[PDB]
Scaffold this active site. Structure first.
Site, PDB file in Angstrom:
ATOM      1  CE  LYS A  15      -4.378  -1.512   0.231  1.00  0.00           C
ATOM      2  NZ  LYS A  15      -4.952  -1.402   2.148  1.00  0.00           N
ATOM      3  CG  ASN A  50      -0.560  11.934  -1.021  1.00  0.00           C
ATOM      4  OD1 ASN A  50       0.367  11.936  -0.295  1.00  0.00           O
ATOM      5  ND2 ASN A  50      -1.631  12.816  -1.466  1.00  0.00           N
ATOM      6  CD  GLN A  67      -8.377   2.013  10.688  1.00  0.00           C
ATOM      7  OE1 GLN A  67      -9.222   2.947  10.485  1.00  0.00           O
ATOM      8  NE2 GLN A  67      -7.035   1.979  10.286  1.00  0.00           N
ATOM      9  NE  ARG A  70      -9.451   5.591   9.848  1.00  0.00           N
ATOM     10  CZ  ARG A  70      -8.534   6.084   9.319  1.00  0.00           C
ATOM     11  NH1 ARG A  70      -8.495   7.400   8.571  1.00  0.00           N
ATOM     12  NH2 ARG A  70      -8.335   5.752   8.181  1.00  0.00           N
ATOM     13  CG  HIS A  80       0.100   7.615  26.798  1.00  0.00           C
ATOM     14  ND1 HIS A  80       0.575   8.738  27.926  1.00  0.00           N
ATOM     15  CD2 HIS A  80       1.265   7.417  25.407  1.00  0.00           C
ATOM     16  CE1 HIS A  80       1.913   9.389  27.221  1.00  0.00           C
ATOM     17  NE2 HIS A  80       2.189   8.777  25.999  1.00  0.00           N
TER      18      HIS A  80
HETATM   19  N1  LIG Z   1      -5.467   0.323   4.062  1.00  0.00           N
HETATM   20  C1  LIG Z   1      -5.833   1.058   4.783  1.00  0.00           C
HETATM   21  N2  LIG Z   1      -5.511   1.664   3.515  1.00  0.00           N
HETATM   22  C2  LIG Z   1      -5.162   4.046   3.911  1.00  0.00           C
HETATM   23  C3  LIG Z   1      -6.191   3.774   5.063  1.00  0.00           C
HETATM   24  N3  LIG Z   1      -6.333   5.536   5.436  1.00  0.00           N
HETATM   25  C4  LIG Z   1      -6.073   5.641   4.572  1.00  0.00           C
HETATM   26  N4  LIG Z   1      -5.705   4.638   3.465  1.00  0.00           N
HETATM   27  C5  LIG Z   1      -5.725   5.106   1.795  1.00  0.00           C
HETATM   28  O1  LIG Z   1      -6.506   5.036   1.497  1.00  0.00           O
HETATM   29  C6  LIG Z   1      -6.735   4.186   0.435  1.00  0.00           C
HETATM   30  C7  LIG Z   1      -7.636   2.978   1.059  1.00  0.00           C
HETATM   31  O2  LIG Z   1      -8.097   2.037   0.245  1.00  0.00           O
HETATM   32  P1  LIG Z   1      -7.542   0.140   0.418  1.00  0.00           P
HETATM   33  O3  LIG Z   1      -8.751  -0.352   0.543  1.00  0.00           O
HETATM   34  O4  LIG Z   1      -6.468   0.308   1.654  1.00  0.00           O
HETATM   35  O5  LIG Z   1      -6.912   0.308  -0.655  1.00  0.00           O
HETATM   36  P2  LIG Z   1      -7.670  -0.150  -2.150  1.00  0.00           P
HETATM   37  O6  LIG Z   1      -6.378  -0.232  -3.252  1.00  0.00           O
HETATM   38  O7  LIG Z   1      -8.509   0.554  -2.665  1.00  0.00           O
HETATM   39  O8  LIG Z   1      -7.754  -1.905  -2.329  1.00  0.00           O
HETATM   40  P3  LIG Z   1      -6.899  -3.382  -2.306  1.00  0.00           P
HETATM   41  O9  LIG Z   1      -5.091  -2.651  -2.220  1.00  0.00           O
HETATM   42  O10 LIG Z   1      -7.678  -3.705  -3.574  1.00  0.00           O
HETATM   43  O11 LIG Z   1      -7.295  -3.814  -1.167  1.00  0.00           O
HETATM   44  C8  LIG Z   1      -5.395   3.609  -0.064  1.00  0.00           C
HETATM   45  O12 LIG Z   1      -5.259   4.078  -1.266  1.00  0.00           O
HETATM   46  C9  LIG Z   1      -4.864   4.064   0.937  1.00  0.00           C
HETATM   47  O13 LIG Z   1      -3.907   4.800   0.899  1.00  0.00           O
HETATM   48  C10 LIG Z   1      -6.523   2.751   6.076  1.00  0.00           C
HETATM   49  O14 LIG Z   1      -6.310   2.930   7.722  1.00  0.00           O
HETATM   50  N5  LIG Z   1      -6.530   1.527   5.847  1.00  0.00           N
END
Ligand SMILES: Nc1nc2c(ncn2[C@@H]2O[C@H](COP(=O)(O)OP(=O)(O)OP(=O)(O)O)[C@@H](O)[C@H]2O)c(=O)[nH]1
Ligand SMILES: Nc1nc2c(ncn2[C@@H]2O[C@H](COP(=O)(O)OP(=O)(O)OP(=O)(O)O)[C@@H](O)[C@H]2O)c(=O)[nH]1
Ligand SMILES: Nc1nc2c(ncn2[C@@H]2O[C@H](COP(=O)(O)OP(=O)(O)OP(=O)(O)O)[C@@H](O)[C@H]2O)c(=O)[nH]1
Ligand SMILES: Nc1nc2c(ncn2[C@@H]2O[C@H](COP(=O)(O)OP(=O)(O)OP(=O)(O)O)[C@@H](O)[C@H]2O)c(=O)[nH]1
Ligand SMILES: [Fe+3]
Ligand SMILES: [Fe+3]
Ligand SMILES: [Fe+3]
Ligand SMILES: [Fe+3]
Lengths: 438, 439, 440, 439
Positions: free
Chosen positions: C2, C5, C28, C31, C119
């Site tokens: 992943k 941004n 989470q 948040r 904490h």
């Molecule tokens: N997994 C995850 N992504 C986050 C989070 N916060 C921000 N993001 C970002 O927001 C988008 C979240 O989408 P994701 O489901 O994690 O990735 P995706 O491409 O949309 O889905 P998959 O890769 O197919 O699992 C991504 O571009 C991450 O960079 C978080 O808490 N968890």
């Protein structure tokens, strides 16, 4: 209202008057004079000239004034004042000679020891020649400048006083610390060539002048008006000063850099009698006396180096032969360094005599080889912390808070080089200079 | 014993003593007096850099790439003999550039001696032969494992091309070595890499291509049973950043309007001065600027220096030329009339550059005009110039692979004369069937 | 793999193991916990939560470790070490409570004086809860981690020794100065929220961590291995410390910022008996006791403020009345500041008693009105830490070797006579407690 | 007595005491609990900011602009009373937003109560009247010179528009004051300025527009002898970069693929929970999430808070909804099927959003497929988007002037059901005559 793109400063907006000063031969001359002199033969990136540097200083001069004027309307800074500081910054280097600092610092003192010459004297003469040859003074008046009054001011900003200043009253004394500052070594001239020289030498310059200009203010110190920096900006200031130190240690005092400079001046010296530069009234000058006439001086650039090298004239074969040795990389050899610590400093006037003194030192034990003064090159490097700048705090914005001597040998064999180290160490002994390291 | 040079774009450059021996010669240091960007410096104050530092960088990148392929793929049988040869090629690929680089073989020689076929690449090869003969380099080559007869061929061929498998210097199983310094097919070679990083650096343009990365992932693979240099599929992204760089340098810098106007002014001075300036060549014979290319000894002495010899000259024979260079210092330039391109696949050849003002000036434009201009008042500027042909590979299977512009200027600056020039030109375009010039 | 941004660090690349830790409820959780607590009620830009700060720390930890591993291979830093430092950076704040520092610094000391709670203890308990509740240990070994030995290393990076360390040998001690540094106040955690807090507060942060990281090296100092900086970077370091100073002077010690924090806490106290949080085994917990069970703690967030405010429950009318005061801006009033200079520092255990002391000071001359202990709020603000001298340097020539407490009192009664009365009591309480004399 | 708040984007914001009186109310401080970008925060970690700070900025900008027009143009008769009203309008234009901002009236209410016509701007007007009634603002209005009857009308009209010259709040000679807070025609208003700057700042996007500059050169001028706000011609360069910011925010952020999937998940949770959640309103009556809009007292207590209320619930009537929000935390999202556009200039109406999955599920998509999907498995996302239409002037003569996207997601995540979803969707696009899905 031209916009010029510069790699260090970005866009440089140029007042039409400034443009009128820049498109003249006396200014375009700076396109043919290397910033670092002999630096280029040691640092391949350093092809840069006085011209773009003059552009940057002129720009930085203006950024600062206009900044001080906006934060503090009570200083009475006019659109007239900003133009003069811009013009002064632009032309402070009009008077540099072939290969910049090499020329007024080593060539003229060896060629004409009696003469007192500095590039700051040279710039004012050249600026006078510039505004006269190109009818600049009417155009100054067209944009609100008072030629008699302002031409003095520009000159005094460059060479210093000719309260000593006639260009501007003392309530505007701070305008005199913008372009070049004697007291705390912080001026827009340093800023440009600090940024600029690192950019071409591959050194990291962490000093941020925009930040310093933003927080710069005029404040009262000992009932004097000076430019001050706010307390937050000491971190930036350590980064300005650390860069100044790196540039000197790594670049400006480079051994081969400086060896090569003395080879070039030895060529100019052996070539001084046989080269003619055309002046006013058609009169002819030599390289060393072209400083005496500004139209000949206009024509004295780095060009003279190649003119010597490409020459077929048998009278210049000696000068030619030294420049062939720079190209073949058969340089003068390093003998040693010493300092006049605790001692009276060697004056510019006495350079000519030094190799004779070195060659005359009696180094007993007696030696297999003997050297004459013509086999010695004596190179004088003059050097010209944070605490010496004055600061302010947001709460009270109104109130304020060396010489190295090196010797080179022209003879390159080990037996002679050994001899040279012996004479040199003796000469140091009986001059009471520091003992050279091994 | 290695020399180490500090360079602003590539950092520390280690130089084999053989390379050093070559560098410390007049035929090479000559490149310290030749602007990389020619008249570019008179528009971009940062563009003061010369061919010299650029030649060091190519030599460096050449070596960097060869040495990298050799370590990752020992079966390619890349020797220290071979690497040294590729390095010299980078080092000496620009030996033959003339006063103000491309202005010289691209406009001056075509305008001064239309009969001649001359390139700086031919020039680089003559200068290189001249270099190794005048400086006794051949013994020095032999000392470090080079076979002068075979290898000197190899270096020339990397520079100028074949002088069926056309190359005599290296067998076809080491063909990939001919793609490093100069790559004819896809225009991706270490030479472009140096002057893209270097030209961006001095001009203040942002360059996103990372060659260190590209070199790190480069491999030799078979494409149509020929050996080529390839990129990993993931790095197709880095390739696009090189081309966005090639494109912004061309749009923003090399095709700059005033920049190219100034080139032709400089060239107009060289033309008007060609007969009264003498360059002493070998055997004491005298050559002119345009014929000094016929002798490498006179050619050695032909540098940017000649611009200032003309400017500072007091000779009354040279006043006509001198005045064009004094125009440039005062900034009274030739004037832009318009731009057009030749439709279809036809490109104006270098030989016909001389005639172009005769054609434009003789065009019959109707309505008839207030002024009539002679051809001597026209300057015609011919300005010359993407995964396709690149070969890729994937990590799983590493062995196998997956324009011209014409601008016209007028020397007369008067409004009545300027209006006339625009008409002749728009007409000239008409029945040469070039595209219609826009306002 | 992943990529997230972030406005402070640009692109943050995240190891799939890290993403697996993040996509859990315990993580989470963050948040919903304001970074600056009552800051948001004084600084509108300050809406940022623990979640993005924790990400930045995790990212910055890795940036520092990877830098050391590439410049100095003899340190023997593995991809396993990098993951552990990252996970530690990432989870160092798992245990912060409603409005962060208000919770472990003032509410629990007032709600349960008997208890020792930080904490940092909280981060470990919650991290243990996370890896257990989400079956993380199988995934840890999938990417080369040794669950037993490395989970120790991580806990130890957060809460300290449980040579004292069991997680890594002493030849890898410098890995213990990355996330949190007791000694020189230079770590990637402060790095993040110095930039992050300035970004949201409209303060200029001139400190460039990238530059500092590029020149960071490990060196031997008194036969100790620590992280050192090149002499050149003192200029940068001076600008870091100035930022640390502005954030504290201007933000973390804001007068109204702190008044509002004690109000939220006053409301949490008056509501503690009547709010139930569902824990493990279904038990119901109070705000002050959800720290005793990690399943209930998870559901204890800034949310609780709005649950009180929206209540129609008459048992919570008292609490509800204070949260209405904050929003109508009828705040507690400032009486004065003092320091325990030269004296023993007020301990967390003794916070509860202090208003009784202040209200019992005999402020003779006698005053028209009398104030009870319930009319005083005393706020103990701690800021534990040239600081530039405690950093260790190197120069390229020798790379091998190295070269307070505030007490504020607020009054709940808002009229001029009582406020005047209040000042008298406060000035007296300082007198026979030997605290500094309050200024005008 | 003027209060000053430091804003990360606008610096110091001075607030008229009347403005402070309005801000320190529950109906306004309500906005401290509503994300600006709603579910954006679950894709962009920097995007934690709420409507509250944005409302302050609009209020700041409104006054900034009104004050400038008055200073350069005293003849416009702009009073201290006029300026106050525009500012209050900027401040309160977002009073009516619901949980997660645009997600609420744009999707939740149209799906939950398809018959009803509801926008937040209507909501802003009701909330604003409830605000001044419950907090006794009208006596305070009169104290600083506002005439409550005439001006409260004026403030509302700047927010929801007219309830021939349609406005009763201000005469037509002061028409330009209606173009400041919200500008319906040319999309240039200080509301847009604020969230363009703020959304860049928290998303890490580059925003090249300089509002301080644009404000300096703004003038009121006659356009079709109607009064409009104009820009100086030289400064169009500033305008293009405004629109470029609007373009990048939309391409890179607001139309983000996963951001918009997540919003429909939140909406699915609010829907499955709409029945079992009670929000207490006026007269003690109990309301549901979808009907809390009917009572401003209930609406006051409906904020982002409803999300955590559902998630932390132990109630089994709410177990279905809870599981969708638990999906979000574990990151098991709905899956993307495809995108399309309504060809022709026809837009899908909000009223018809509810049925969109019914049409998709009933499409007969021969080829026949291994699985068949019901309407409960489809989410249809209607994504809505709401340079020359600006009016300029010249320094010499200053008085006078010179889409919809549709996405479909599947709740079943397996390879077999997902394939079916693509076919149903491609067919629906076909016999709705929408454009052909890509990939
Ligand atoms: N997994 C995850 N992504 C986050 C989070 N916060 C921000 N993001 C970002 O927001 C988008 C979240 O989408 P994701 O489901 O994690 O990735 P995706 O491409 O949309 O889905 P998959 O890769 O197919 O699992 C991504 O571009 C991450 O960079 C978080 O808490 N968890
Ligand atoms: N005038 C001038 N411009 C320079 C010089 N060096 C670089 N430049 C830049 O190069 C560009 C071309 O220069 P100019 O001769 O002024 O061309 P121009 O802008 O078309 O000038 P005009 O004929 O007045 O329209 C300018 O935009 C400058 O930014 C210089 O020495 N003189
Ligand atoms: N040889 C050579 N070095 C150059 C040149 N241009 C820049 N340099 C650099 O400048 C340095 C100057 O050193 P040299 O000129 O070689 O003199 P030196 O260091 O005494 O060389 P040695 O006598 O061989 O040890 C070199 O080491 C290079 O890094 C060049 O044209 N030729
Ligand atoms: N009034 C108000 N101020 C805010 C708000 N958010 C941030 N602030 C800033 O935080 C500061 C503290 O709040 P104050 O209004 O001064 O509270 P106070 O000092 O107890 O009240 P006064 O003594 O009457 O000024 C203000 O001066 C504002 O600059 C808000 O929502 N309302
Ligand atoms: Fe200078
Ligand atoms: Fe090249
Ligand atoms: Fe932290
Ligand atoms: Fe808005």
């Amino acid at each position: 209202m031209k916009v010029i793109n510069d790699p260090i400063h970005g866009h440089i907006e140029l007042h039409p008057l400034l443009v009128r000063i820049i498109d003249t031969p006396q200014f375009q001359r700076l396109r043919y004079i290397k910033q670092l002199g002999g630096g280029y033969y040691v640092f391949p990136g350093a092809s840069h000239n006085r011209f773009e540097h003059s552009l940057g200083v002129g720009y930085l001069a203006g950024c600062l004034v206009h900044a001080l004027g906006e934060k503090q309307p009570e200083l009475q800074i006019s659109e007239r004042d900003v133009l003069c500081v811009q013009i002064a910054g632009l032309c402070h280097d009009l008077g540099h000679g072939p290969f910049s600092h090499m020329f007024d610092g080593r060539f003229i003192p060896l060629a004409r020891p009696e003469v007192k010459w500095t590039h700051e004297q040279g710039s004012v003469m050249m600026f006078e020649h510039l505004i006269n040859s190109n009818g600049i003074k009417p155009v100054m008046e067209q944009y609100g400048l008072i030629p008699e009054e302002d031409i003095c001011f520009i000159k005094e900003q460059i060479v210093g006083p000719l309260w000593p200043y006639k260009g501007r009253p003392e309530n505007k004394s701070f305008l005199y610390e913008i372009v070049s500052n004697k007291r705390n070594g912080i001026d827009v001239d340093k800023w440009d060539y600090f940024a600029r020289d690192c950019h071409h030498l591959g050194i990291q310059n962490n000093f941020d002048y925009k930040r310093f200009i933003k927080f710069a203010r005029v404040c009262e110190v000992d009932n004097e008006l000076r430019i001050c920096a706010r307390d937050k900006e000491v971190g930036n200031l350590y980064d300005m000063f650390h860069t100044r130190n790196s540039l000197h240690r790594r670049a400006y005092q480079h051994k081969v850099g400086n060896i090569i400079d003395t080879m070039i001046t030895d060529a100019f010296l052996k070539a001084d009698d046989y080269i003619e530069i055309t002046g006013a009234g058609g009169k002819k000058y030599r390289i060393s006396t072209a400083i005496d006439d500004m139209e000949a001086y206009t024509k004295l650039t780095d060009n003279i180096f190649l003119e010597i090298l490409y020459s077929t004239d048998p009278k210049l074969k000696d000068a030619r032969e030294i420049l062939k040795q720079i190209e073949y990389r058969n340089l003068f050899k390093y003998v040693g360094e010493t300092q006049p610590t605790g001692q009276i400093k060697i004056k510019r006037e006495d350079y000519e005599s030094l190799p004779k003194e070195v060659a005359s030192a009696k180094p007993k034990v007696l030696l297999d080889v003997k050297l004459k003064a013509e086999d010695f090159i004596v190179d004088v490097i003059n050097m010209d912390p944070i605490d010496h700048v004055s600061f302010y705090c947001k709460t009270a914005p109104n109130r304020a808070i060396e010489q190295l001597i090196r010797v080179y040998c022209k003879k390159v064999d080990r037996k002679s080089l050994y001899a040279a180290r012996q004479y040199f160490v003796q000469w140091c002994a009986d001059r009471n200079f520091t003992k050279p390291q091994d």
